[PDB]
Design an enzyme around this catalytic site. Structure first.
Site, PDB file in Angstrom:
ATOM      1  N   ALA A  30       0.771  -1.258   0.000  1.00 42.07           N
ATOM      2  CA  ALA A  30       0.000   0.000   0.000  1.00 42.07           C
ATOM      3  C   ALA A  30       0.804   1.310   0.000  1.00 42.07           C
ATOM      4  O   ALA A  30       0.324   2.336  -0.516  1.00 42.07           O
ATOM      5  CB  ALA A  30      -0.951   0.011   1.185  1.00 42.07           C
ATOM      6  N   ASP A 164       2.601  12.217   1.126  1.00 39.90           N
ATOM      7  CA  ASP A 164       2.013  11.801  -0.143  1.00 39.90           C
ATOM      8  C   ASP A 164       2.575  10.420  -0.483  1.00 39.90           C
ATOM      9  O   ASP A 164       3.787  10.252  -0.806  1.00 39.90           O
ATOM     10  CB  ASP A 164       2.251  12.765  -1.266  1.00 39.90           C
ATOM     11  CG  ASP A 164       1.365  12.432  -2.509  1.00 39.90           C
ATOM     12  OD1 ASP A 164       0.921  11.266  -2.693  1.00 39.90           O
ATOM     13  OD2 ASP A 164       1.087  13.355  -3.235  1.00 39.90           O
TER      14      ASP A 164
END
Ligand SMILES: CC(C)CCNC(=O)[C@H](CCC1CCCCC1)NC(=O)c1ccc(CNC(=O)c2cnn(-c3ccccc3)c2N)cc1
EC number: 2.7.11.24
Length: 343
Positions: A30, A164
């Site tokens: 992820a 981010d």
């Protein structure tokens, strides 16, 4: 040069300084190729990211440089920072792997909102922190552009950092994207990020995605249902004939009264949402302005909302060869000065 040890983890070879111990993959992909590790210099848990094929193409190489430059710049409580950056390579000639070390964060906001709807006090504090980090980023002329609850990390003490995480080898970025950078991408400013903070804050207050659009058109339709179709004053700032034609093609819709939508919420939170979710980007509240909003009375301290040092973005305009971007990235690895330790 420190001493490096080698191992293999979930389809990949990690070669890291002995400083970093007990590596274990996190997020099942992820987050990228990322391990939690124990840092023996500090006695803290850290996260170690191995960049994927950092110099495969000109585009990857520039992206690598860019991420390193941005991380080396960020020095603020509410923005991810760089604890270390290393390569096992001894020379530029051998340089092919880049590892980044940051704090290990506790959970993202996507995980936290999916778990419980938050208290108004927790909403105040989390949104305040986002805005404080954004005042900083924006002061360096850096725009995040990808703000969404999975790019915000929070610890047990509710301290938040903006990051981010990038792609995935699910929360759609589109749901939180400003209408102006939904079709055209010329006329936009830093307040694209403020639009995203409004969408995030709505979802924290209600427990529901505000604008869960299926695509760019549906997304726009959901947006205009709340904020209303553009009036004459905004219509005359739209240069794109096709966008203007599309907007003007819609059956006109009025702005909703946000108190009728966010029924039961703190009125100061409702008032702030009205200031963030304005269609006209020239009229949207800035991060600095938002921090002085009455909703943040309990947290706001004008002497403790610092700006950034200037950031040299002049590389963005350059078109260079892979080996050039690689060498610049190597320079930045070498010149790295680690942060003060004493936490
Ligand atoms: C490709 C493109 C889409 C963007 C690529 N992106 C970047 O360039 C930015 C660079 C800095 C940005 C920081 C925010 C403001 C804008 C610049 N880059 C990072 O933010 C960036 C870089 C490296 C790392 C490494 N750390 C982790 O992975 C990490 C840490 N904690 N946890 C954790 C979180 C929640 C629960 C459990 C564990 C992790 N998984 C983390 C973020």
């Amino acid at each position: 040069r420190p001493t490096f040890y080698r191992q293999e983890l979930n389809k990949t070879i990690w070669e890291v300084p002995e400083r970093y111990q007990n590596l274990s993959p996190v997020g099942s992909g992820a987050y990228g190729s990322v391990c939690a590790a124990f840092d023996t210099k500090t006695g803290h848990r850290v996260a170690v990211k191995k960049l994927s094929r950092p110099f495969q193409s000109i585009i990857h190489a520039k992206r690598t440089y860019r991420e390193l430059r941005l991380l080396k710049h960020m020095k603020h409580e509410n923005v991810i920072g760089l604890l270390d950056v290393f390569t096992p390579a001894r020379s530029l000639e051998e340089f092919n792997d880049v590892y980044l070390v940051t704090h290990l964060m506790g959970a993202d906001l996507n995980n936290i909102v999916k778990c419980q709807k938050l208290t108004d006090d927790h909403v105040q504090f989390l949104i305040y922190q986002i805005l404080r980090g954004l005042k900083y980023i924006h002061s360096a002329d850096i725009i995040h552009r990808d703000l969404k609850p999975s790019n915000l990390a929070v610890n047990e003490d509710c301290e938040l950092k903006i990051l981010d995480f990038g792609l995935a080898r699910y929360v759609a970025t589109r749901w939180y994207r400003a209408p102006e950078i939904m079709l055209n991408w010329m006329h936009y400013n830093q307040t694209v990020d403020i639009w995203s903070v409004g969408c995030i804050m709505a979802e924290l207050l209600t427990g529901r995605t505000l604008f869960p659009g299926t695509d760019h058109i549906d997304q726009l339709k959901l947006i205009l249902r709340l904020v209303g179709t553009p009036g004459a004053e905004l219509l005359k700032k739209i240069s794109s004939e096709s966008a203007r034609n599309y907007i003007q093609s819609l059956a006109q819709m009025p702005k909703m009264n946000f108190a009728n939508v966010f029924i039961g919420a703190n009125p100061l939170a409702v008032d702030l949402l009205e200031k963030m979710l304005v269609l006209d980007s020239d009229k949207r509240i800035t991060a600095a302005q938002a921090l002085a909003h009455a909703y943040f009375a309990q947290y706001h301290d004008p002497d403790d909302e610092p700006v950034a040092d200037p950031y040299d973005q002049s590389f963005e305009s350059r078109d260079l060869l892979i080996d050039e971007w690689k060498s610049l990235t190597y320079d930045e690895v070498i010149s790295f000065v680690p942060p003060p330790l004493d936490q």
